[PDB]
Design a binder for this molecule. Structure first.
Ligand code: SF4
Ligand code: SF4
Ligand code: SF4
Lengths: 74, 74, 75
């Protein structure tokens, strides 16, 4: 799978959104639309549009999504 | 994604870690069975994700369908 | 207390982890600032301690003064 919901408590704590274009720039001014789970060093889905994230147990995140822990790759 | 244990890593080689439990070395480890995997191990911290931490291998993650000779039923 | 993360650990290198945020690779991570550290990260579990756990680094502890690319501003 099931997909993380934006109302889930853990999602709220990190500002997770299923669409990076809807991220809350008032809390996270350094967010860009170039940041998404697809380009995050923690995403486990490779080129797939959905996949696992270590911060979100028993759920999958969408590649076009984002959270405040978005981690630029090395 | 977080880096995975390499089967050629020294601790991996010694313990017989394999990324898929179906490829475990039964000659060295006759107590292995294909129902044993990181996913059913007491030490695996990945929950339902395809990869997750194992404290023994701290620094690199293990694959949920993998196995090593330190496997212990949860 | 557990062993501290080493900057050469594979998971640390993947996240650009440094034990001191003032040594972060600002060329690779241009949005880093020294206001970002584990002590100000939503993921840090050590509270006011100088070292403590982080969910991204199993079996170890991170330095509170440290930083990695997953630094998460608190909600
Ligand atoms: S940590 Fe990375 S993969 Fe996980 S939801 Fe946040 S941006 Fe997506
Ligand atoms: S101790 Fe358990 S979780 Fe760790 S690699 Fe071995 S079988 Fe997998
Ligand atoms: S996720 Fe946060 S607490 Fe963990 S190493 Fe990175 S900056 Fe430090």
């Amino acid at each position: 799978a099931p997909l993380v919901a934006e109302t889930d408590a853990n999602a709220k704590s990190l500002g997770y959104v299923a669409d990076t274009t809807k991220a809350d720039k008032t809390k996270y001014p350094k967010h860009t639309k170039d940041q998404s789970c697809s380009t995050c060093a923690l995403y486990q889905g490779k080129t797939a549009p959905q996949g696992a994230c270590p911060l979100f147990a028993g759920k999958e995140v969408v590649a076009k999504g984002w959270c405040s822990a978005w981690a630029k790759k090395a």
